[PDB]
Design a protein around this nucleic acid. Structure first.
Ligand SMILES: Nc1nc2c(ncn2[C@@H]2O[C@H](COP(=O)(O)OP(=O)(O)CP(=O)(O)O)[C@@H](O)[C@H]2O)c(=O)[nH]1
Length: 466
RNA sequence: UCUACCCAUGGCCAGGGUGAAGCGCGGGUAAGACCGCGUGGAGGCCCGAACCCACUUAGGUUGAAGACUGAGGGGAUGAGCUGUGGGUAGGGGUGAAAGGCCAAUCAAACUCCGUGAUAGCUGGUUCUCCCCGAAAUGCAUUUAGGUGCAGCGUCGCAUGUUUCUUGCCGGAGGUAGAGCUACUGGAUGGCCGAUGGGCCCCACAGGGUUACUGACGUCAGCCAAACUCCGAAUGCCGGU
RNA sequence: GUCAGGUAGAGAAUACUAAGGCGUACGAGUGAACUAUGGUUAAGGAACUCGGCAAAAUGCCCCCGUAACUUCGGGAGAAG
RNA sequence: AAAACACAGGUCCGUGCGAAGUCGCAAGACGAUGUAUACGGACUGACGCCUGCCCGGUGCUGGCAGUAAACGGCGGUGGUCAUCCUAGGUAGCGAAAUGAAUGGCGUAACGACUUCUCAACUGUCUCAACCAUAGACUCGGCGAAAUUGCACUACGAGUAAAGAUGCUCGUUACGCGCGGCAGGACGAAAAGACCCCGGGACCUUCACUACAACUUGGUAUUGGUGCUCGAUACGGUUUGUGUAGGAUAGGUGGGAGACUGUGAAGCUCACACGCCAGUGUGGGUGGAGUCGUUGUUGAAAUACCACUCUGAUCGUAUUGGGCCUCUAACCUCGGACCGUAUAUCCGGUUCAGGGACAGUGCCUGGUGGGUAGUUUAACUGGGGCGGUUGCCUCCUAAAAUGUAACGGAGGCGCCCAAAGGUUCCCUCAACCUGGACGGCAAUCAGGUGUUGAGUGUAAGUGCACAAGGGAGCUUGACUGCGAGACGGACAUGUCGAGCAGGGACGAAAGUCGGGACUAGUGAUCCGGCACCUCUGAGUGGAAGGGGUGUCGCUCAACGGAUAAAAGGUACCCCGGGGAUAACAGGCUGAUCUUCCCCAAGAGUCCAUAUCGACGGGAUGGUUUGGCACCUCGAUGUCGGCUCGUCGCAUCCUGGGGCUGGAGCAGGUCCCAAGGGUUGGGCUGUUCGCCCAUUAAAGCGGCACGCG
């Protein structure tokens, strides 16, 4: 450019941001012992994203999410290139100044792997590939691959496959044929719910006709596994046991809490989304009533829009709850970015299924290893919260106390006396009603029990006034 | 003589509306523009018969008809329709251009001639009995549904068991099988245990001795079209 | 190509008729279904359907009254 | 019948006048009885809007001045080519009714155009009924046609060239008619238009080869004058370095005479040469002999020549090219007369213009789809796209040879003057030991080391006896041959003992006609080059031919159609094919569909109320497929309508078990096919979405039933 729209000194329209090959942390790197063959850790993925929003500090966690995605998905990151583009690029994504830079960046990797962050229309992916000719899958395809490798239940192996088909259907030509040509089991290779390839050799399939047919069958099957789930939850619904759910960002001790308060024993792997199918377990409020506890799947910033069906059961558990719990990973940078996304998910849930929002119990987790990011009322960034340490079980008592006190009691506290002949009633109050205490009176007892509705009218006749 | 276009010379277009220029009276206006009122009758104007077309629908669809009928439809003073007489002719004509039309036919008319065109393609090829009796393979092919040569039939002449079967004898294999501690590779479980780690007491030595891992071997149990230390049965080549 | 009666009518349209010319060359029956061409229809009124295709509707004369827009001519027989 | 063509309007290009353009071989014609405000061709298509930074000079019309992105540049930058003022239909201006500001927006009126909505109306429909006429039907008369192997021509389930009136086993059926329906006779009709193969046709082009047309030149018509550059012929003293030197000498053969007193040698000077070798020309007091083979230089003498040529460029004869003209050939559709009463024809005479130009002939190059004749491969699990095509090596290949696939892996189109021949000698790879660099690791020593290294090059077969590693000498990487065989359609391809001649190496025996072996290549024709004793169109020669050796092809589609060749056809046509595709049928069941088996787990505890991973086994024949068996001398497609009929894998209704069945209501499984299973708006929908109901708004087969 000699005199074309005078912009000398930039060639990228931005004084500071322009072409931003920061390589600040260089994402992250690995170490020895990944040296058996070349496919145990091969996709030395380079990352790229657009700073199109506020502080690059709050966007650093955004690319940390992608780095963690790659780490849990297997293949280890090798480089990261975050562009300070003012606004998202309309047709391409890289910046058109890095359209050549990308190749000389990726000559430093180990195997062909470049990853974008935002969801890319096929318009992007038609030339973003031609930029380097190396397979590029965005963050949504990475989430779909993670779930594909983590799917284990029949329901999940259909929801994940449907989500992948619904994501790949728009971007069939070009990109779709690109991973059709590339059949080695890459990061985009996914696998569907099989995980151990199977349809992984077909990846996300290629044919639009075949995709459409399998999509119709999967729609029908997911329809069936909702009138299965309603049956399975009927027993809880009919008994109206007080339900408590645990939501929040992934890796925030969401399953460790449910293995901590109650001795459930669910998988607690360190990687990202692993408890991909909701599981619920019984529990007793320390003082009185019993309850049920449910741990959900896991939320992410800018959640993929093809995974709402895979999250549908999670949403159902969220709606059918009394005390919602968003667990925040205390020992992590910016412990609020997770919170805003989780909350936003909550609003879209309460909107899609119109219901009175339930109280949201707040717990900060991993404060045992935290360096006190606030170390004050600053650490009380949300002043209402309980600082539990699931790795050590510190706030369990305080949590177990306040969670019940914040669930509300639908009991009926009465004072009743029972002549000894009808010890059946004494036993029924002592095993169903959660009696506080009493003194063992001459003929009866001064029982002060938070008796329920079935026995409320039972004990009305044998009442007392003292 | 149909149709396309052109030339010469003739004819036809019921009826009913609208109302251009111009002109006049004027006004209007400084005057002009213009505005009113009259006359006037223009227009590839309007509605609509004859006429010329052919938009829709139904019928016909071995028709009444090798392109029509019924009902509606478009133009109908015009780049109009039409009579009579002419002109342009085939790689040519004409074409408000459709590969349209040029005598019921047009991505090159018809007729006769070259001419009995040619067709690796299709069809057809007419009486009897007797004797023998296939092939659908190889090679080559502007070749793959054709053909050339070889193989297999038959007839004749020459030779005469040379053919074939069985027994015996002499042969070369690397198949079936099996084996791998005999090569090249895969691979299971131990034992031996280098080294690397092991890193602490604390030396930096030496020790403990590594969740360890692990050279090197070693034992056991396996695998292979393109592995063979091995290795048949049949078949094949000679002799008898 | 020539002629173009009468009444109704603007009309060479249409209907009925004068002059004149014809009954046009297979007939006779018969309430079959069905097909064609006509006719009518309760109550709804395009629900039919690819699609108001087809049919139905409007239609004449005289008085009034006539929109957006406009190339100032028209629209316009507006509509009513 | 239109959105296509045309159109008025516009823009560009060409044309100065029997014009350009077109028809004709030409003459001639139209253009036009016109004349740049006109005519021809090409694009666009009323009308409007969008839209130049402002005039110096590459230059232009020329008289300085236009001009606009006439050419830049939008740059300062007015401004709005106006003062000054810069060699991209362009981001000028970068201005969203909408990349077009020469291509996009608008646009009144108009349209048998396309797509929607409203009001009115209606048998279009709910959902039909009735009436008349013309057929149909009956009676009398006349009286066809396509079709046709047959015939006292059933149905089910099978079988069969895989869809049976004809076959098999059963079930049903008295003989002959009439009126109707349209499910079959793969009904009739048309030697399938789709698809493939072969032929053709017409079209296109930077396919090949030609031609027309245009055009560049040479020359003939075609001549004269001059200038004019010289391509021209014919002669010329002095000049001329080894020149031996009476001394810077062209010979030559005559050579002994010429120069002779107007002037010998010797000269002296101006000037050529200038290599002062010093010759000389010319000029000058100038003369009264130097001379010459004087043998002299191979050789004159500056004595001559007759030549030779050698001086060194002056005259000298014809001659090309250029320029200038001129008239006389030739040309004029410029005029005037005459034949000629008639005459824009034609010819003749004459004047006026051109004029050796043009036009035309023969020759010669260039452009040349304007036109023609033709080419444009085959294989192929249809064709196309993609790949391949010859040679070598493995596996397939079933222990001889051979053996296919669009089966599994690779290589080659060479390299080497030594990496060939011979003689002689040697042994590796790896391991251990210990030595400065030195390291697991360059070199050294010792020890193990029997083949695991190497072998130019792929792979295989081999080779430690070495074919592997060295050194010496050599060219057998020969000539004339080759008994006998291998492989073989043929053409090719191989091996070969041994003989003779001349060699190499080795003392000799003996080995040597390329390389451990198997790839490294191309027939024939045609034509080069060298040698030879062949032959030489009457003869002698030569030309040409012949023989021997050898050379020229990615003729790689590699047994090689021509030396030379790409496409389109939905405008297509013919000849064939179910040898081969699209629909349907048939086989398979990968895919699909419905279940089942084991039980990790989920389900508040809880494998099995409801679900069920990881794996396995099946049914069915509805999806997409795979195959290519029937049909290409025709088996008419999707959807909708009408009419159905059947299965159950049951949507509703009916009967049961379990339940995480308290009741109400559900979930799941079993039994159950009698009946029923709505009407609309959107969608090609094939699918589906939406609206209002319903007991419910089932899924499927029947050529995806039914033209
Ligand atoms: N140090 C520490 N680590 C914790 C604490 N709580 C949870 N973690 C860690 O978080 C990790 C993620 O395990 P998990 O409990 O599944 O977290 P999660 O949020 O449920 C991840 P998912 O959403 O996929 O189930 C575990 O490895 C666990 O060790 C804590 O209090 N301290």
């Amino acid at each position: 450019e000699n005199s074309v729209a005078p912009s000398t000194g930039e060639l990228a329209l931005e004084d500071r941001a322009s072409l931003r090959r920061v390589a600040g942390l260089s994402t992250e790197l690995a170490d020895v012992s990944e040296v058996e063959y070349r496919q145990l850790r091969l996709e030395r993925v380079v990352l790229v994203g657009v700073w199109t929003e506020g502080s690059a500090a709050d966007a650093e966690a955004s690319l940390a999410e992608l780095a963690a995605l790659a780490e849990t998905a297997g293949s280890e990151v090798l480089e990261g290139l975050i562009q300070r583009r003012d606004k998202p690029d309309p047709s391409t994504y890289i910046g058109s100044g890095k359209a050549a830079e990308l190749r000389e960046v990726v000559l430093a990797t180990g195997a062909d792997t470049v990853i974008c962050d935002g969801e890319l229309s096929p318009a992007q992916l038609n030339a973003l590939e031609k930029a380097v000719k190396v397979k590029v899958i965005d963050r949504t395809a990475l989430i779909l691959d993670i779930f594909a490798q983590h799917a284990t239940s029949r329901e999940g192996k259909a929801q994940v496959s449907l989500a992948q088909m619904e994501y790949m259907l728009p971007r069939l030509r070009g990109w779709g044929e690109s991973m059709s040509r590339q059949a080695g089991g890459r990061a985009g290779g996914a696998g569907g719910g099989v995980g151990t390839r199977g349809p992984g050799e077909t990846k996300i399939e290629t044919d639009r006709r075949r995709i459409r047919e399998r999509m119709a069958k999967l729609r029908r099957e997911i329809r069936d596994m909702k009138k299965i789930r309603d049956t399975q939850r009927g027993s809880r619904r009919r008994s109206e046991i007080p339900s408590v759910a645990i939501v929040g960002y992934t890796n925030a001790g969401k399953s460790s809490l449910l293995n901590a308060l109650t001795g459930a024993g669910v998988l607690v792997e360190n990687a990202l989304f692993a408890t991909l199918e909701p599981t619920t377990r019984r529990g007793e409020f320390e003082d009185g009533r019993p309850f049920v506890l449910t741990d959900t799947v896991g939320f992410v910033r800018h959640l993929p829009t093809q995974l709402v069906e895979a999250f549908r059961s999670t949403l159902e558990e969220v709606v059918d709850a009394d005390l919602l719990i968003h667990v925040v990973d205390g020992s992590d940078v910016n412990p609020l970015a997770q919170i805003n996304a989780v909350r936003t998910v909550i609003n879209e849930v309460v909107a899609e299924y119109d219901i009175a929002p339930p109280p949201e119990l707040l717990v900060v987790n991993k404060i045992d290893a935290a360096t006190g990011v606030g170390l004050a009322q600053l650490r009380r960034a949300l002043p209402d919260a309980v600082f539990v340490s699931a790795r050590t079980g510190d706030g369990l008592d305080k949590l177990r106390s306040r969670m019940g006190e914040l669930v509300e009691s639908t009991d009926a506290t009465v004072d009743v006396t029972i002549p000894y002949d009808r010890g059946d009633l004494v036993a029924r109050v002592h095993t169903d009603g959660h009696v506080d205490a009493t003194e063992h009176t001459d003929a009866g007892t001064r029982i002060k029990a938070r008796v329920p509705a079935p026995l409320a009218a039972t004990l009305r006749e044998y009442a007392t006034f003292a």
